[PDB]
Amino acid sequence: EMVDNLRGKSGQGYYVEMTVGSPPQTLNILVDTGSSNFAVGAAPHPFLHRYYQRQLSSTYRDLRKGVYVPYTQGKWEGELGTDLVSIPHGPQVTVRANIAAITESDKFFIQGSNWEGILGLAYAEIARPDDSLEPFFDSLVKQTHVPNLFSLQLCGGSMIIGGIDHSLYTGSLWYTPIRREWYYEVIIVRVEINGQDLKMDCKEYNYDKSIVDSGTTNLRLPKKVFEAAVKSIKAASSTEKFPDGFWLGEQLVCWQAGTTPWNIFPVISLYLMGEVTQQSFRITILPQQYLRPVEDVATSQDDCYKFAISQSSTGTVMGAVIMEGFYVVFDRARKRIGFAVSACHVHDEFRTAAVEGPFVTLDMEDCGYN
Numbered sequence: 001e002m003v004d005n006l007r008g009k010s011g012q013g014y015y016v017e018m019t020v021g022s023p024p025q026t027l028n029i030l031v032d033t034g035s036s037n038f039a040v041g042a043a044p045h046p047f048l049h050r051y052y053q054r055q056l057s058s059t060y061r062d063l064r065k066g067v068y069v070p071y072t073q074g075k076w077e078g079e080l081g082t083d084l085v086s087i088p089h090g091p092q093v094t095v096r097a098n099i100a101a102i103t104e105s106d107k108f109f110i111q112g113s114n115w116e117g118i119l120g121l122a123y124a125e126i127a128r129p130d131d132s133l134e135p136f137f138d139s140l141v142k143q144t145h146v147p148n149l150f151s152l153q154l155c156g157g158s159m160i161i162g163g164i165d166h167s168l169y170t171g172s173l174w175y176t177p178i179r180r181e182w183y184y185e186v187i188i189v190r191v192e193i194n195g196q197d198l199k200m201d202c203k204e205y206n207y208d209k210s211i212v213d214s215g216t217t218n219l220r221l222p223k224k225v226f227e228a229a230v231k232s233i234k235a236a237s238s239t240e241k242f243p244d245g246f247w248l249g250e251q252l253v254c255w256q257a258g259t260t261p262w263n264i265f266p267v268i269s270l271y272l273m274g275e276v277t278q279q280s281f282r283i284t285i286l287p288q289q290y291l292r293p294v295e296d297v298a299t300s301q302d303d304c305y306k307f308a309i310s311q312s313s314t315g316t317v318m319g320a321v322i323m324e325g326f327y328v329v330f331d332r333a334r335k336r337i338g339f340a341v342s343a344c345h346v347h348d349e350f351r352t353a354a355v356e357g358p359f360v361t362l363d364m365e366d367c368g369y370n
């Protein structure tokens with residue numbers, strides 16, 4: 001009953017239906033593994049179809065404390081409280097959870113996204129105001145019999161709470177350790193483009209950190225890695241030349257509908273640390289993943305895309321365009337993240353996104369930045 005309980009797209013977010021308060025108020029909530037605050041619009045906003053009305057809830061409790069949360073994109077401020085929360089198409093439980101009632105925001109809510117709040121699924125260590133504010137999933141596990149694990153299949157899609165759904169993936173699940181429990185932090189040990197090693201000290205791939213983040217759209221790479229990746233992708237696709245603004249993820253590239261030259265763009269392989277010493281596995285990303293379709297009726301004589309790999313100063317972010325096509329298991333109980341090929345895959349007749357291994361490495365360097 002949890003299958004297909006997500007709607008949305010990489011550019012605007014994937015969301016699940018939830019209820020808050022007594023009696024239940026229904027809201028669509030973006031699923032975000034890149035933060036740890038549960039927050040909902042709680043006052044009118046031009047882009048909100050509905051919002052949390054605290055005065056209508058008999059179970060609302062004000063915590064008499066404000067909270068401010070800045071993201072890479074957008075920020076909001078609100079008032080902390082607790083109330084009853086349920087997930088109509090998830091586990092049939094009700095939990096009392098912390099909720100930030102958003103009273104002001106900037107560039108956070110997205111016009112037409114159809115969601116009104118955000119569910120931070122990461123760990124308390126990055127919750128605001130601080131780690132004393134128990135995140136929703138922690139409350140869910142404490143208050144119910146739900147196993148300490150969830151999985152995401154972003155396509156709509158599915159959030160499976162408390163378990164793994166075999167119908168949602170094919171082949172084997174490969175696991176990489178969660179290096180530290182704050183973000184879902186992982187370690188990348190190698191990057192290839194078209195099979196060619198970027199040939200970089202592997203700490204560079206994780207400079208600062210690397211995280212798995214359903215709330216970010218792009219694959220975001222540390223500047224040094226980003227520049228090297230663009231150089232390699234340019235070289236592979238050199239039979240066509242694009243403006244610098246395309247590679248900067250600013251402007252669209254368009255082709256006559258149906259004629260997108262997928263074959264001239266390379267596959268990207270990200271090798272993740274395995275659960276055994278010096279062992280790794282790789283996930284492979286097709287251009288159908290990293291060239292993000294931009295729907296616009298005005299341009300619809302063409303298919304147009306944005307380059308969805310971009311620069312970061314805060315480490316690697318494996319965003320939604322990376323997670324799409326994979327089934328991703330956030331195995332909190334065992335401190336690991338699993339990857340498998342998703343049942344909803346976009347591969348043409350020549351290449352297929354993959355999760356595969358094992359691979360071994362001779363260089364004993366720890367790739368974590370620290």
Ligand SMILES: CCCOc1cc(C(=O)N[C@@H](Cc2ccccc2)[C@H](O)CN[C@@H](C)C(=O)NC2CCCCC2)cc(N2C=CCC2=O)c1
Pocket residue numbers: 010011012013014030032034035036069070071072073074107108109118126127128213214215216217218219220310317319
């Ligand atoms: C759903 C996709 C929306 O599009 C987007 C969204 C974001 C973005 O900032 N997403 C937020 C949530 C959001 C969801 C929806 C709207 C706004 C924010 C997510 O939490 C980001 N996670 C990490 C990186 C983070 O910044 N954590 C915070 C640390 C401090 C404490 C609070 C958590 C970046 C983005 N970017 C920016 C550059 C390239 C890219 O893809 C495109």
